[PDB]
Design a protein around this ligand. Structure first.
Ligand SMILES: CCC(=O)Nc1cccc(Nc2nc(Nc3ccc(OCCOC)cc3)ncc2F)c1
Length: 252
């Protein structure tokens, strides 16, 4: 086995998470999530080459890749286990009665992950609340960064005009998605453009219209998410700038 390969005989399966994705242990002790990849769904040899690079991405707010099990059908992706599950579902649980400082911390967690990926010139390509996870300490981490490249729903609601019009993907299309994610956080997990179809959303956006302020977002927080939606990609901030903006708000 190479350094990116896990021997599946070292896994114990403990529970279904949803896929299929299972919770288990590696060598009896260490918690892991085990993603079983359905036959025909993935460009597996391309993915495995990329997994070698994903092995070296390491940031506290990025869900860690531990390795892949490649010698059989199906293959498995082994990652960090996140006990509190998907961010979208967490936001929607009304029992949490979240304070806005907790929402802002979620945004900062993601922004830190994305600033790291940006520093490595690595695009997420599908940033959204559904691709973020929550651990037992309430920390949000970004998952499945880059993964859509190996898949054989397009995220219209998280895409800037130049993606929808021309298929122009860049750092600035991740920025636009991050602004939509902040909106999802402050809206407690509402679907963006909830009364529109994808086709209507694409028109709305291309005509220069936008999401508007969630009730829980202060004017300062709204200005940060809104800055991600400039019609001109080059006038959108970087993740570094966004992180400084989010820290300034926390301080005020
Ligand atoms: C919103 C999107 C969405 O559901 N995505 C999704 C679903 C299932 C598994 C994965 N992957 C991973 N999950 C965990 N932890 C996890 C924990 C609890 C949980 O609760 C049971 C579900 O319903 C109670 C679900 C997942 N850790 C790492 C993963 F890689 C991603």
């Amino acid at each position: 086995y190479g350094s990116w390969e896990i021997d599946p005989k070292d896994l114990t399966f403990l529970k279904e998470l949803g896929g299929v994705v299972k919770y288990g242990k590696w060598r009896g002790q260490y918690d892991v999530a085990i993603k079983m990849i359905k036959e025909g769904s993935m460009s597996e040899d391309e993915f495995i080459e990329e997994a070698k690079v994903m092995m070296n991405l390491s940031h506290e707010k990025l869900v860690q890749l531990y390795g892949v099990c490649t010698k059989q059908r199906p293959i498995f992706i082994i990652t960090e286990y996140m006990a509190n599950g998907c961010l979208l579902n967490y936001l929607r649980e009304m029992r949490h009665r979240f304070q806005t400082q907790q929402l802002l911390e979620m945004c900062k967690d993601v922004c830190e992950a994305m600033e790291y990926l940006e520093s490595k010139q690595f695009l997420h390509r599908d940033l959204a609340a559904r691709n973020c996870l929550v651990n037992d300490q309430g920390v949000v981490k970004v998952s499945d960064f880059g993964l859509s490249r190996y898949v054989l729903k397009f995220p219209v609601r998280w895409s800037p005009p130049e993606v929808l019009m021309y298929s122009k993907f860049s750092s600035k299309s991740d920025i636009w998605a991050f602004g939509v994610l902040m909106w999802e956080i402050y809206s407690l997990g509402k679907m963006p453009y909830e009364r529109f179809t994808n086709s209507e959303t694409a028109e709305h956006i291309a005509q220069g219209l936008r999401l508007y302020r969630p009730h829980l977002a202060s004017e300062k927080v709204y200005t940060i998410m809104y800055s991600c939606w400039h019609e001109k990609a080059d006038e959108r901030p970087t993740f570094k700038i966004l992180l400084s903006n989010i820290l300034d708000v926390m301080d005020e």
